[PDB]
Amino acid sequence: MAYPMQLGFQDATSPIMEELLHFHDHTLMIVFLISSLVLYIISLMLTTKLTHTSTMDAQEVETIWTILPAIILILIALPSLRILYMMDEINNPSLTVKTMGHQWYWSYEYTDYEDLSFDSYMIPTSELKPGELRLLEVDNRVVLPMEMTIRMLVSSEDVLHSWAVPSLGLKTDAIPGRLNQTTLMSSRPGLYYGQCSEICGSNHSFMPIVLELVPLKYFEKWSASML
Amino acid sequence: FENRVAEKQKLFQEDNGLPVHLKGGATDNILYRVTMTLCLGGTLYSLYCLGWASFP
Amino acid sequence: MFINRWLFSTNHKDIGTLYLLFGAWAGMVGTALSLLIRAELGQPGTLLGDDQIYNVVVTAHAFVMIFFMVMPIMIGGFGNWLVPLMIGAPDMAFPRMNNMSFWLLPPSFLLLLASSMVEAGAGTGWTVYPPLAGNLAHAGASVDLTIFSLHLAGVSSILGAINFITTIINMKPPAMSQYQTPLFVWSVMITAVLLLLSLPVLAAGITMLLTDRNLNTTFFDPAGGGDPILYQHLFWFFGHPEVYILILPGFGMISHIVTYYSGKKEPFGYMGMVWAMMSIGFLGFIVWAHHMFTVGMDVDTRAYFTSATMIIAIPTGVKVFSWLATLHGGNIKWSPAMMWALGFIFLFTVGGLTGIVLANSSLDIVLHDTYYVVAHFHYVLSMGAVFAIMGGFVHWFPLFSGYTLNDTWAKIHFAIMFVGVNMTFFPQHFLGLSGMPRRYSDYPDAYTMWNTISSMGSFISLTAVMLMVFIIWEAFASKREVLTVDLTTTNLEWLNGCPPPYHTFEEPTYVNL
Amino acid sequence: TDEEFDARWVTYFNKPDIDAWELRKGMNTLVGYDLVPEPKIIDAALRACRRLNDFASAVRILEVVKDKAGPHKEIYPYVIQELRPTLNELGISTPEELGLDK
Amino acid sequence: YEEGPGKNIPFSVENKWRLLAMMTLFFGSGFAAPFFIVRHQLLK
Amino acid sequence: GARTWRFLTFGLALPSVALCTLNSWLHSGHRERPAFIPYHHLRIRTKPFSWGDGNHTFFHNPRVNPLPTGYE
Amino acid sequence: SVVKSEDYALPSYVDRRDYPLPDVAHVKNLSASQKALKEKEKASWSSLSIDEKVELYRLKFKESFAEMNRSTNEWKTVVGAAMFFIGFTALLLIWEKHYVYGPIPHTFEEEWVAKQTKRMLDMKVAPIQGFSAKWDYDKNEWK
Amino acid sequence: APDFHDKYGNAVLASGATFCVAVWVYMATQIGIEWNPSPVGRVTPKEWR
Amino acid sequence: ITAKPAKTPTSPKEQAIGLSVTFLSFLLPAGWVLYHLDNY
Amino acid sequence: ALAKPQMRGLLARRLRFHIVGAFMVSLGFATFYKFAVAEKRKKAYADFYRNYDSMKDFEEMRKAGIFQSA
Amino acid sequence: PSITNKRIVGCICEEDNSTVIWFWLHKGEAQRCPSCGTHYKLVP
């Protein structure tokens, strides 16, 4: 989850999120440098009493200021598209889990073997247990095995929603009549939080996602206990 | 039929200061007043309808 | 005489004045809505106790700022006042149709404020996506009133586009080629072409939404074989062109302002500026699905939209560097208008660069539907459009009115607004990177510090807006009449005096070959 | 080349029947360039001021030389040094000698 | 029609105090409207 | 006018060619050739070709064009 | 010299450092003494007094370069006034906090935050750089 | 002849700066705004279970 | 730009009145609504 | 007597000098940013995972009582 | 030509200049374009 006064991304939970952090670092250096250079050049143009107000020839300089940006865009696009096609590559999941968005809660279906399904609602503020997080906790967490490739399938039974977990690099819209696929792999155990990410009405702010990542043997026993 | 365009050219070029939408004569004034009365009356009715629809 | 002049106008200047008054009033509405947003977000917990009302406020904020403030001011106001004067034309091509483009806007606005007053409002976002905007999740008249608002705004701008394209093509002096028209006139022509092509697609899509809500069609309803994603494609096919429509006249005004206050006869690289605006207009039609990177589209489609989107930076950079090259060697006059334009160049550049971050679909997965997007467009659109409007307004106020502003007050106004908008929007980058969703009435406690600072910034900009009203009053209260204006040889709109007579160019300009 | 530029401008101001419009056009055009004019150009412009019976324009020309140097404080005193024989021959007082630098 | 400064506008600038009232009502009504819309929605 | 068509040539048409050239040159690497299967609807031989040994197509590429009996 | 609205279409006088020789003289109308001074200007400028040379300058031009290019104290007014209005803004925020904002949620209570902090460290929130990375699990203290 | 800025600029700058700092410091520190800063180096974690 | 002196000069006192009335026109109605939110 | 100073191309000269200065600074910033942000991040993740024991991390979380499932 | 005693001239000083130079031409002595010096004379 996010922490107070946070400036950047949540720490990466998945290898793809790690990749996104290094790509963001590369891109932001470029944004910083260009922003700075424009501000600097503004200040340079504005700090002399020397003048030159006759017609100035443009063609030589326009070569520089098309070619250099084209090269910079290629240096962004190359690693950008490498990550795009890395996520898309065939991975062989161990487990498929469905999530269905509703106004205003998530349901989860684990139907590889048994018909396991349940609803996941925000814990009201007045019912939080000491130490628990306002607007983020749910009654029934999405328990998943750590260090395993999981296929998540996302849809809705009413309006649009969007299933997001920032620390895993995940955001997939939940569209009725459509079954959208994404892959989830956690490098670590723990609790990973997200929030509905398509405006779905009055309680859009209040239908969070909590993943609980545990060893396979714990997941298997939890699965059995939830039938 | 006969070509009466010259007679309409004379009427619509008469130096009487009338704007083109009234230059045909008394019938233009009536059709203008009908149009503007329905527009302004209908607009007041539309505001009444909003007032009504703004409450349960 | 008053009704004949102000309700029955066929005069480009008076219609322009009507648009500026309308847009200024709309900006107060849109500003009040923005302050309600930030008052809710300024402390964790609930203020309004009704998140449907929060969603209505956000939706109305966007529609008012886009359709009733920026487009009427830039195109209706500056376009009507300046375009005929800059080409020596005696009016617009269709001077009576021009008046109907204006008078469609008060009714459009009335339908939007009816949408908010009936039932529970349209709490949809300005995108109005189904099924949230459909007849189950938004039962009753609110969304239909919003759709009709957009229909009347659309007709207004389509007929206005026809008017400006025809005027600009057909009503220049016979010796004047397209390559001897001022950059502002180019900016309006290109904006008008984008309006002509994009708004009919929006009209088709919101019409489909209307029939799904009222005539039992199923364009967007999977139960009938429809698809909510089809609505998104039609909306954004309009919506990306729309964001370039909102900035292009601003680019035109910035070119004139930077040229003027640099003491130059001409912008640097005229033909490059023309090329850049036409390239931006063209590319603006082939990038829309960067608004849809999370909907489930194919990897190759994501790769295409990422790449095509990034291409826009090349012509845009040519414009930024050409503005800097216009300053280069200038006898710089530090007028309030110049300050607005310099603020524009910097803040636009920041927002454009966060756009290039978003263009990368891999990073957009994590940034989509977060405050990072809100930060991006309040830099490029919100601050870019507003800074260009304020620069144009203070530059041309003495032309339109015949009176001068107090330059010291106008510089005070600029300074407060620059502080306020940066304090408001810069921290929203941090909120977005750290995962705060947009369109939220309340937030996890971690996000409190940046939301608190952002809301405090929104109050600084309110102080700037109140001072702007006072500054306009003081100008009309004091009645300092214009005597002389520099650089009329390369700024034709000034050459008929301040204000120009009701009829200008009754005898056209003489231009030989 | 620099010599050809300077020669064209000397020829411009040296035209015996140069009119007031041409004097102004020349000086207003010249100060648009990225240079402080060479003393030989300023000399020719000052002598055109003399043929046009225009003392004030001669003083204004010296002011604009100083202005075109911007922060390069060494240029104006150098140009005045080079012009001293012309200033003495034509009785042109510097802006400094007239107190117009205050 | 009247031409010149203060004459090419649909409002009078003959009296700066009447103008202040008119501007107050004009901008003030636009800025107030959303607060009164929120109040209306809350009172249903 | 000529000026407008030159502006389209250098400002739209040739930049398009430059971008498609960049696109092509990014995907120019050799694809792994598919296993040979002697399908009867392919590698048709009803009459020897009037060149070489009669069994090679006119722009035969040994790397990607198998003969009826397979890759050379 | 009185500049008039109805002269807008005629060349006008300007003081601009980039336009040193404006289209008209500052003073077009001459008194008897000023006429005699313009006659004297047709003779050797060596015979003009300093005062006569200044009077000729001031007929042709309004301000000198030094006068038209002078610095001003305007920046103090602009910066000070902007700080005043930004200060005024904080009064509005004090009013909003006092009269509009009610209590914030109980999750901001010091004891809640101490517990939530420990729970975040127990689930190793941001353990690589962001949060738990700043906690020393061996010494039970912030690093 | 001295203008507005020559007569009043020093006082406008000094008074505006003094007032701005005073009111923002008071607003930030004295009226119960919850800034929710980082607990790092500030909060002693406490048992929650 | 050059301009005439003001035809109807607005004194510092008059500016303080205009600025005060302008600010109150924005602040009082919104203030009234926000003060009464609990009541609504 | 004063020496003849450079009188031509002073604005052009100033631009050239400061554009080169800006490039040189841009290169120094990229080096600093490589070290202070991008490399620091690569090393933080590499160092975290080098001897990372996911089961030990899970056991610590389980014993702290964080999980519904364990 | 003019039907009055002044008319606006725009001067395209060189073929293909994008910048047009605008000025009022008054009845009486020929005036010159302030950019290229081209002479214009009003014929009312």
Ligand code: HEA
């Ligand atoms: C031009 C477009 C524009 C402008 C100007 C603004 C201006 C502002 N906007 Fe925004 N805003 C949007 C377009 C705009 N906005 C859009 C499209 C959305 C998305 C809606 C959705 O999600 O569906 C949005 C959403 C949005 C949000 C996100 C809400 C959420 O996700 O829950 C926030 C949050 O702080 C915000 C704040 C503001 C603030 C504080 C201002 C201002 O207060 C900043 C200061 C600017 C001014 C005060 C304007 C001054 C101008 C005038 C008064 C005109 C004067 C006229 C003349 C001189 C002629 N706006």
Ligand code: HEA
């Ligand atoms: C004025 C309006 C405006 C303008 C001009 C832009 C310009 C750009 N926008 Fe933005 N955009 C919005 C208004 C605007 N946008 C709005 C309102 C939304 C949200 C809608 C909603 O959801 O409600 C949005 C959303 C939006 C998204 C969707 C994000 C999401 O929802 O997840 C993306 C994705 O690519 C995008 C990208 C860009 C890009 C690449 C540009 C480019 O055109 C920017 C180009 C400019 C520069 C790059 C800076 C100057 C260039 C240089 C100095 C040269 C050197 C630079 C480089 C080499 C990089 N914007």
Ligand SMILES: CCCCC/C=C/C/C=C/C/C=C/C/C=C\CCCC(=O)O[C@H](COC(=O)CCCCCCCCCCCCCCCCC)COP(=O)(O)OCCN
């Ligand atoms: C590079 C772009 C264009 C290149 C043009 C072609 C170059 C060589 C020949 C030129 C003439 C072409 C015209 C069309 C005729 C038939 C085939 C041409 C197409 C071609 O070149 O096809 C080649 C085969 O050519 C073959 O068989 C053999 C081709 C040679 C013999 C053709 C003889 C037939 C002539 C027909 C005459 C009819 C004329 C019509 C008159 C009508 C008037 C009413 C393809 O190579 P491949 O190895 O099979 O596959 C590639 C594997 N890597």
Ligand SMILES: CCCCCC/C=C\CCCCCCCCCC(=O)O[C@H](COC(=O)CCCCCCCCCCCCCCC)COP(=O)(O)OC[C@@H](O)CO
């Ligand atoms: C659900 C309900 C929503 C619908 C709301 C409908 C909106 C508005 C009501 C429409 C009222 C129309 C009244 C007739 C308008 C005729 C306009 C016209 O014919 O305008 C002409 C110009 O446009 C031209 O030609 C070419 C343009 C002719 C345009 C004709 C009118 C179009 C109306 C709708 C257009 C939307 C387009 C549909 C696709 C998106 C004439 O221009 P003027 O300035 O008048 O004169 C110029 C003089 O020199 C002539 O002697």
Ligand SMILES: CCCCCCCCCCO[C@@H]1O[C@H](CO)[C@@H](O[C@H]2O[C@H](CO)[C@@H](O)[C@H](O)[C@H]2O)[C@H](O)[C@H]1O
């Ligand atoms: C030139 C000025 C402009 C003219 C303005 C016209 C104003 C007069 C409108 C009359 O009002 C009507 O009254 C009926 C009530 O008696 C309504 O009937 C409707 O509402 C009824 C409610 O009883 C329902 O039975 C039916 O839907 C239906 O008959 C109808 O909707 C409504 O319009």
Ligand SMILES: CCCCCCCCCCO[C@@H]1O[C@H](CO)[C@@H](O[C@H]2O[C@H](CO)[C@@H](O)[C@H](O)[C@H]2O)[C@H](O)[C@H]1O
């Ligand atoms: C957070 C964003 C903050 C925005 C800050 C706003 C700063 C306010 C600037 C006003 O101060 C004045 O600025 C003039 C220009 O407006 C200066 O002109 C002087 O200096 C200039 C040199 O560039 C010359 O052009 C002028 O002739 C000369 O009088 C003048 O001395 C100075 O007092």
Ligand SMILES: CCCCCCCCCCO[C@@H]1O[C@H](CO)[C@@H](O[C@H]2O[C@H](CO)[C@@H](O)[C@H](O)[C@H]2O)[C@H](O)[C@H]1O
């Ligand atoms: C985002 C835009 C708004 C920003 C904040 C505006 C700043 C506030 C301006 C003052 O507003 C007023 O505040 C008073 C309180 O100070 C209110 O009086 C209320 O409180 C008084 C004191 O209890 C009573 O006497 C009154 O009857 C009662 O209405 C009054 O109604 C209201 O107009």
Ligand SMILES: C[C@H](CCC(=O)O)[C@H]1CC[C@H]2[C@@H]3[C@H](O)C[C@@H]4C[C@H](O)CC[C@]4(C)[C@H]3C[C@H](O)[C@]12C
């Ligand atoms: C040919 C055309 C118009 C020239 C004229 O008639 O004045 C000019 C105007 C803008 C020019 C373009 C812009 O300067 C941007 C690019 C600059 C590059 O150095 C060449 C390609 C580039 C895309 C240019 C090609 C061409 O020279 C353009 C398109």
Ligand SMILES: C[C@H](CCC(=O)O)[C@H]1CC[C@H]2[C@@H]3[C@H](O)C[C@@H]4C[C@H](O)CC[C@]4(C)[C@H]3C[C@H](O)[C@]12C
């Ligand atoms: C007799 C009359 C002459 C009209 C005239 O020149 O004034 C003719 C000329 C063309 C005729 C029209 C055309 O022949 C076409 C139509 C033919 C139908 O049989 C009758 C109606 C019809 C629409 C005709 C009506 C009328 O008889 C018209 C108008």
Ligand code: CUA
């Ligand atoms: Cu569900 Cu937003």
Ligand SMILES: [Ca+2]
């Ligand atoms: Ca709140």
Ligand SMILES: [Cu+2]
């Ligand atoms: Cu877009």
Ligand SMILES: [Mg+2]
């Ligand atoms: Mg979305």
Ligand SMILES: [Zn+2]
């Ligand atoms: Zn010319």
